[model samples]
Target: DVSGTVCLSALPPEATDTLNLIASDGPFPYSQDGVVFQNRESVLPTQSYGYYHEYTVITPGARTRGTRRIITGEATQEDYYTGDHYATFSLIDKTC
Candidate 1:
């Protein structure tokens, strides 16, 4: 991880709606949205195995997952965002 920060305000407008869905736990578009992240990329912070979960951020008109994601720490309120799939990540400013 090169290191970065992005608030909800900095993300695409669709991110706001995705965050809302995550908070409400639901009505996700993809079946994989609520699955365990596995942290295979190791770009996220160190934590227990089951501490991470991943969700998809819909890209308007895209047929697939679209490379954007919101990775949430199950035990920590902090969340991460990646626009380029698992390549880079930014810690989200939840205060927004």
Candidate 2:
């Protein structure tokens, strides 16, 4: 099983905020922020459907929600963040 690659402390402010919200069971800012992530891009670890949930990371100065995202898995609750619209990711560690 894959663990984490980067600590939350190293992420951007927006990513940090998203993790906080996940912990809090947030009333997220965007309607689409908290939704089932299909992982159709196959960039993340493989799992059964509905195993992952995705949330948006607010981008500063962008009129829209931007492409950055955070995805957490169902089983272990491990997290992954993609800065380029799901093209790639770095693991989000528990230490954060």
Candidate 3:
């Protein structure tokens, strides 16, 4: 499952918006956005601190931050998505 990939079109529209924000180096909404994502779950390839940063995808009507997130691997310029929080991840393939 470590090699899973998700097509860009399959992601939520909000997640696509978050990706754009990340590309522009944000003016990210939540303070938590762009925070270091320590991979304590070990679900992803082990990397040092600051290697991974997370962004929140606004849930249109949800009052809370919700569970969806876009995790970026800084060094590789790779992005990953998780719908049910950090329990699982799938690499984002924009060209898929």
Candidate 4:
């Protein structure tokens, strides 16, 4: 298993705009339970709160005739920030 933290800072203008668009027009990739996965409120920090999403991926395979294994990984976006027209996201990854 593996685990780590990722930090994103000093975002460019284009990236900042992309983040805004995603936050506004997304349920991106689909959602379950009729609950959208995207943030529907303002992300101004002062006006409304933001939303976070976590994901996982898995792969199973047999490397040899008698050997089989599964690889699993997960990631969580812990925080997203925007200030002075700059934006960035922080996340963590874990694998087992």
Predicted structure with the largest TM-score when compared to the true one: 3
| Tens digits of per-residue lDDT for model 3, 9-80 | 988889889998998999898999999999887888998888899999888888999989999995535899
Model 2's lDDT to the true fold? 0.81
Arrange candidates by TM-score, descending: 3, 1, 2, 4
What lDDT does each candidate get? Answer: 0.82, 0.81, 0.87, 0.27
Residue pairs that clash (backbone atoms under 3 angstroms), model 4: none
Give the root-mean-square deviation of each candidate in angstroms.
1.6, 2.5, 1.5, 15.0
Candidate 1 wrongly placed segments (more than 4 Å): 74-76
Q: Provide the TM-score for each candidate, comma-separated.
A: 0.88, 0.86, 0.91, 0.22
> Cα miss at 57, model 1 (Å)?
0.6
Q: Quote the positional error of residue 74 for candidate 4 in Å.
A: 9.9
Tell me the deviation in Å of residue 65 in model 4.
42
**Residue-level lDDT tens digits of model 1 in 31-65:** 99878787786777777777877888889889888
Give the poorly placed runs of model 4, Cα more than 4 Å off.
1-9, 26-96
Q: Which ranges in model 3 have alpha carbons more than 4 Å from their true place?
A: 1-3
Number of the candidate with higher TM-score, 1 or 3: 3
Ranking by lDDT: 3, 1, 2, 4
Residue-by-residue lDDT tens digits, candidate 4, 1-96: 112233233433333333343445533332321232233332212222223332211112524221111111122233333221112222222120
The Cα error of candidate 4 at residue 15, in Å, is 1.0
The TM-score, computed over Cα atoms with residue i paired to residue i, of candidate 3 is 0.91
Give one digit per residue, the lDDT tens place, for model 2 in 1-96: 233487778778899899888878897989987698998877777888888889999989999889889988864457888777787887887575
